[PDB]
Swiss-Prot record, chains A, B:
InterPro entries: Ketosteroid_isomerase, NTF2-like_dom_sf, SnoaL-like. Pfam families: SnoaL_2 (PF12680). It catalyses: a 3-oxo-Delta(5)-steroid = a 3-oxo-Delta(4)-steroid. This is Steroid Delta-isomerase. The lineage of its organism: Bacteria, Pseudomonadati, Pseudomonadota, Gammaproteobacteria, Pseudomonadales. The active site is at 16 (proton donor), 40 (proton acceptor). The gene is ksi. Signal peptide: none annotated. GO terms for biological process: steroid metabolic process. CDD domains: ketosteroid_isomerase.
Length: 127, 127
């Protein structure tokens, strides 16, 4: 595809959350441009490239059980970008905890994620 | 104040929504740096400076009745930034309509909004 339209951004960003929710690390990584960046949380230096991004998703999703779900609609733009609110549910030392996040993404002219910025801080974690 | 901490960002961004919700145009504008930018929606060129920003809030809030409320928590950073999901309720040609938005803000070293980016597109409007 080309630079995604607003509708296409909403579909891609929702599909990303679906893939996170099931934990399909390889399918998630494919959604990113080969040279994409991730800033997690926003405020920390970016990681770069699909192998580092794969390592990030292996670290986050390969361990205990993880779920993720949109908590409201994707807000998209007409320049290939969007923002979405979601909650991640996981386990910490065996006890159920959640993290509220907003991801901001920019897509490239092939429909792949060029940049991802995950807004959250420690108070967004609840046990 | 200085560059707001994560907790301070959550308070400032919630206070912004409170001021939008009541429609206190002058108090809203005071929250911005004198030379701040606003991108509404994200994808459009920025407006610049408190007078243009005041004109933007007069245009959006001075007419029919407008409400705004967070639809989930503020996600803050440790570098003076944050993102929040909210809904704006207004009237269009007399009929109740809503707009789902995510604002991303960066604050300056005085606790004022330096940049605001409002993510939304037309499908986020509902009648
Ligand atoms: O904090 N995280 O790990 C995180 C942040 C943003 C995301 O889109 C996904 C994850 N995750 O896979 O868990
Ligand atoms: O779309 N808008 O007008 C808008 C966008 C973001 C905001 O933080 C506030 C408004 N408003 O005052 O209505
Ligand atoms: Cl929402
Ligand atoms: Cl939320
Ligand atoms: Mg699922
Ligand atoms: Mg490329
Ligand atoms: Mg109120
Ligand atoms: Mg200044």
């Amino acid at each position: 595809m080309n630079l995604p339209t607003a509708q296409e951004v909403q579909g891609l960003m929702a599909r990303y959350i679906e893939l996170v929710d099931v934990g399909d690390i390889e399918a998630i990584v494919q959604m990113f441009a080969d040279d994409a960046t991730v800033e997690n949380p926003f405020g920390q230096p970016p990681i770069h490239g699909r192998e580092q991004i794969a390592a990030f998703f292996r670290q986050g999703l390969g361990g205990g059980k993880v779920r993720a779900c949109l908590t409201g609609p994707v807000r998209a733009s007409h320049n290939g970008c969007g923002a979405m609110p979601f909650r991640v549910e996981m386990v910490w030392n065996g006890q159920p905890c959640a993290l509220d996040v907003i991801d901001v993404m920019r897509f490239d002219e092939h429909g792949r994620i060029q940049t991802m910025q995950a807004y959250w801080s420690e108070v967004n974690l609840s046990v």
